[PDB]
């Protein structure tokens, strides 16, 4: 049901807080 959120967790995550912080 879920393995969306895993994969792009695995995938995004580092991106995802450099993102937040305007892209760093």
């Known amino acids: 049901f879920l393995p969306i959120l895993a994969s792009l ?3 995004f995550g580092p991106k995802l807080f ?7």
Not at 18 to 24: E, G, M, Y
């Open 9 to 11: 967790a695995a995938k």
């Open 18 to 24: 450099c993102l937040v912080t305007k892209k760093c």
